[PDB]
Structure 1
């Protein structure tokens, strides 16, 4: 139906190309928590070429023209758009299967999130080299919603502990229950063929 990608620990370009192909193949993909997407090169380097991006400004009226987005959701959304044929109506419809969310909204906070090990910083960068966070190059460039998001993450993650705390309550119980066996006639055929 729809896949949900957690975005932290991933690279900017390695994730957004895989989103750009999976969204051309008919799926509905939703990338959540695109605040902590890493991007290679140190922070002062990547903050330069975003400031160079901001002055690409049409001279005669900047109102029409290049729309510099600053939230790291639409930074990630604009990266996918440059890897799509958005001037065609097949490339328009590809963007409508992408819905990107910064932070974690309540339709998407209780789903299970997937990661892409192609795009992870742990996978793909050599560990002795420097990387930039997309959250604080957005915060350095006009994104005025870092504090109101990082408040709502710890309100979100505190509610997620008390779920997981009581989940491992539940599976301590059904593991203590399956000690009370009474069923080893059925345990023959699963251990025989990979329980």
Structure 2
């Protein structure tokens, strides 16, 4: 689609969401993934930490400054996963990669916007409830990410502000329902039309 797709990273499985995002950006679509520290990875935490440590061991023995660049932020980890699912060595793949934006937490551009969810990548439906999983934020913190605490604090501030905004919206919706109950003699004429044609149960 022509607008920017904003996806909440919390509760999503890493590879599923990354595959969906890769296929989206390959179709000429702008995708923004926020709160990449909430991304889950299937399998217990120690196993995934071992996987990332084994990745850390892969470095160029001659000159490690040329070797694989092990990114420690959850956003950059998800970005590297998506890049792994993209043909990033061609112009088309690089152009698709430039359409993807990843963030830890939710920045000011996107904290005032509705966030989509991919059910096909959600942990609650793609994973059995008895299975174990790891948080990308905790894994990133314990492998070298430095900004877990400041991200948590800023997320708490954002959640407080969102709670205030939601209380205002609930008050507005209550007042709207009261208004609808106030005007029913001058509204039932159109209300019955909407009821007749499937809208407005």
Instruction: Give TM-score scaled by structure 2 length.
Output: 0.93
- d(CA) in 2 for partners of 1:187, 1:118: 42
How far the C-alpha of 1:181 sits from its partner, in A, is: 2.0
Assess, with a 3 A threshold, how the Cα gap between structure 1 residues 135 and 185 changes in structure 2: closer, same or farther: closer
- d(CA) in 2 for partners of 1:35, 1:174: 37
- d(CA) in 1 for partners of 2:196, 2:119: 27
Assess, with a 3 A threshold, how the Cα gap between structure 1 residues 71 and 192 changes in structure 2: closer, same or farther: closer
Aligned to 2:187: 185
Higher helix content, 1 or 2: 2
Assess, with a 3 A threshold, how the Cα gap between structure 1 residues 37 and 151 changes in structure 2: closer, same or farther: same
Q: How many residues align?
A: 195
How far the C-alpha of 1:183 sits from its partner, in A, is: 4.6
Q: Match of 2:102, SS?
A: coil
How far the C-alpha of 1:190 sits from its partner, in A, is: 4.9
How far the C-alpha of 1:7 sits from its partner, in A, is: 0.5
- d(CA) in 2 for partners of 1:113, 1:55: 36
Assess, with a 3 A threshold, how the Cα gap between structure 1 residues 178 and 189 changes in structure 2: closer, same or farther: closer
How far the C-alpha of 1:74 sits from its partner, in A, is: 0.3
Assess, with a 3 A threshold, how the Cα gap between structure 1 residues 189 and 179 changes in structure 2: closer, same or farther: closer
The ranges of structure 1 where at least 4 consecutive aligned residues each deviate by more than 4 angstroms after the TM superposition are 182-195
How far the C-alpha of 1:189 sits from its partner, in A, is: 5.6
Give the gaps of 5 or more residues in structure 2.
none
How far the C-alpha of 1:186 sits from its partner, in A, is: 5.0
Assess, with a 3 A threshold, how the Cα gap between structure 1 residues 88 and 109 changes in structure 2: closer, same or farther: same
Assess, with a 3 A threshold, how the Cα gap between structure 1 residues 170 and 86 changes in structure 2: closer, same or farther: same
- d(CA) in 2 for partners of 1:88, 1:29: 20
Q: Match of 1:69, SS?
A: coil
Q: Match of 1:65, SS?
A: coil
- Structure 1 window deviating more from structure 2 (124-133 vs 177-186): it is 177-186
How far the C-alpha of 1:180 sits from its partner, in A, is: 1.1
**RMSD over equivalenced CA pairs, Å:** 1.5
- d(CA) in 1 for partners of 2:162, 2:118: 22
- Structure 1 window deviating more from structure 2 (174-183 vs 14-23): it is 174-183
Assess, with a 3 A threshold, how the Cα gap between structure 1 residues 185 and 113 changes in structure 2: closer, same or farther: closer
- d(CA) in 1 for partners of 2:35, 2:17: 13
Q: Match of 1:184, SS?
A: coil
